[PDB]
Design an enzyme around this catalytic site. Sequence first.
Site, short mmCIF file in Angstrom:
data_model
loop_
_atom_site.label_atom_id
_atom_site.label_comp_id
_atom_site.label_asym_id
_atom_site.label_seq_id
_atom_site.Cartn_x
_atom_site.Cartn_y
_atom_site.Cartn_z
N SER A 61 53.31 54.35 22.66
CA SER A 61 52.02 55.01 23.35
C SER A 61 51.64 56.11 21.91
O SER A 61 50.57 56.35 21.80
CB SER A 61 52.33 55.73 24.34
OG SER A 61 52.42 54.81 25.49
B1 LIG Z 1 53.02 54.70 26.77
O1 LIG Z 1 54.21 54.78 26.19
O2 LIG Z 1 52.60 55.90 27.19
C1 LIG Z 1 52.89 55.83 28.63
C2 LIG Z 1 53.55 57.20 29.30
C3 LIG Z 1 53.71 58.29 28.02
O3 LIG Z 1 52.82 58.44 27.36
O4 LIG Z 1 54.70 58.90 28.09
C4 LIG Z 1 54.09 57.28 30.50
C5 LIG Z 1 53.83 56.02 31.19
C6 LIG Z 1 53.27 54.80 30.75
C7 LIG Z 1 52.80 54.83 29.41
C8 LIG Z 1 52.14 53.62 28.77
C9 LIG Z 1 52.84 53.33 27.51
N1 LIG Z 1 54.15 52.74 27.87
C10 LIG Z 1 54.27 51.42 28.26
O5 LIG Z 1 53.41 50.56 28.73
C11 LIG Z 1 55.71 50.86 28.78
N2 LIG Z 1 55.29 49.19 28.44
C12 LIG Z 1 56.61 48.83 27.63
O6 LIG Z 1 57.51 49.22 27.24
N3 LIG Z 1 56.22 47.34 27.29
C13 LIG Z 1 57.52 46.66 26.57
C14 LIG Z 1 57.19 45.23 26.45
N4 LIG Z 1 55.65 44.70 26.24
C15 LIG Z 1 55.44 43.70 25.33
C16 LIG Z 1 56.10 42.16 25.64
C17 LIG Z 1 54.91 45.37 26.92
O7 LIG Z 1 53.52 45.35 26.89
C18 LIG Z 1 55.36 46.52 27.97
O8 LIG Z 1 54.76 46.87 28.53
C19 LIG Z 1 56.01 51.22 30.15
C20 LIG Z 1 55.75 50.65 31.15
C21 LIG Z 1 56.23 51.16 32.41
C22 LIG Z 1 56.96 52.31 32.41
C23 LIG Z 1 57.38 52.86 33.86
O9 LIG Z 1 58.62 52.59 34.22
O10 LIG Z 1 56.55 53.04 34.60
C24 LIG Z 1 57.38 52.74 31.47
C25 LIG Z 1 56.82 52.30 30.12
#
Ligand SMILES: *[B@@]1([O])OC2=C(C([O])=O)[C]=[C][C]=C2[C][C]1[N]C(=O)[C]([N]C(=O)N1[C][C]N([C][C])C(=O)C1=O)C1=[C][C]=C(C([O])=O)[C]=[C]1
Length: 324
Positions: A61
């Site tokens: 992010s």
């Molecule tokens: B990002 O890091 O910002 C963010 C925060 C933050 O700003 O701290 C908090 C919650 C969500 C988000 C969205 C952004 N992070 C994610 O989307 C993250 N997704 C991933 O890590 N991935 C890796 C793999 N790929 C490609 C194959 C992806 O497209 C992907 O989504 C994410 C998703 C869910 C969660 C959760 O546990 O709720 C955390 C991180």
Amino acid sequence: ALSLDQRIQTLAYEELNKAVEYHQAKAGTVVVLDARTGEILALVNTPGRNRAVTDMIEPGSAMKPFTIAKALDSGKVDATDTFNTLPYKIGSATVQDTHVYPTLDVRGIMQKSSNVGTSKLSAMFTPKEMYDFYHDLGVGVRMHSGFPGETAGLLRSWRRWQKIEQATMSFGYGLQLSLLQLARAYTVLTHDGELLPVSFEKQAVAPKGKRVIKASTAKKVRELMVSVTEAGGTGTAGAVDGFDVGAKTGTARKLVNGRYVDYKHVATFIGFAPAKNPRVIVAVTIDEPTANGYYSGVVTGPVFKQVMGGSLNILGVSPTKPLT
Ligand SMILES: *[B@@]1([O])OC2=C(C([O])=O)[C]=[C][C]=C2[C][C]1[N]C(=O)[C]([N]C(=O)N1[C][C]N([C][C])C(=O)C1=O)C1=[C][C]=C(C([O])=O)[C]=[C]1
């Protein structure tokens, strides 16, 4: 003589270690740059190699402010523009956020850290225009900092990108850099759109930067990033009393040579202050916290907070607004 500032280096060390202990995390790094010169005022790791320069991560992010920077710089998007931010399909694949907003403007995408929004902004440009841009921030490029083992990170050629890869790259997966490359990259935002070289040495001459976006764009993005630390944003844990802080959170699932495993995370928190006229960047990364949750906000927010607050105290920057 080194640009390193012992007081700040000590502060970073204390605060990193308290956090990596509290959260029973595997490893951690903190970097502090001079926002206007690229000098390294502090650089600190858990014991072992210099991860801050040798190891590469997916920014997640923390990459989003650049995609927004690029969109605004182009003239094709204004901050006030609204986007449909509902889940959608790139052929066989699905782009979606954790929390779903029907629509966001650019400030909302920044504030709420929306993958969908970010990927729509990106979707307005070619593979080549986005690779050239990431390249000009230094992704995949050697810094020549003089540290032993310095990784250049990873920027796959645009010539072989699926459309899904343009998207996932715009919100920080598929490409890799060191925490120091990432902090360096933020010099584009803090040094009026110019990318500074990084240095462990005091510069006799004030260093020049390569222009990447216009000053007015940097200025606007800094304004938008303040939303992250104000009520409504991902990054309120990183607010500092007496200042406006531009910051971006990142919470990423871990790439373990090939596969994404979803019970493992990397928390990163990076930002600058004073937001309008910045003096320092602070980048914090904590690898695999086990105890007390995993969100950037909870894990890396407090350490950002203390280090930024303490850093502006030490350099003698006056609060821009009264202390609560
Ligand atoms: B990002 O890091 O910002 C963010 C925060 C933050 O700003 O701290 C908090 C919650 C969500 C988000 C969205 C952004 N992070 C994610 O989307 C993250 N997704 C991933 O890590 N991935 C890796 C793999 N790929 C490609 C194959 C992806 O497209 C992907 O989504 C994410 C998703 C869910 C969660 C959760 O546990 O709720 C955390 C991180």
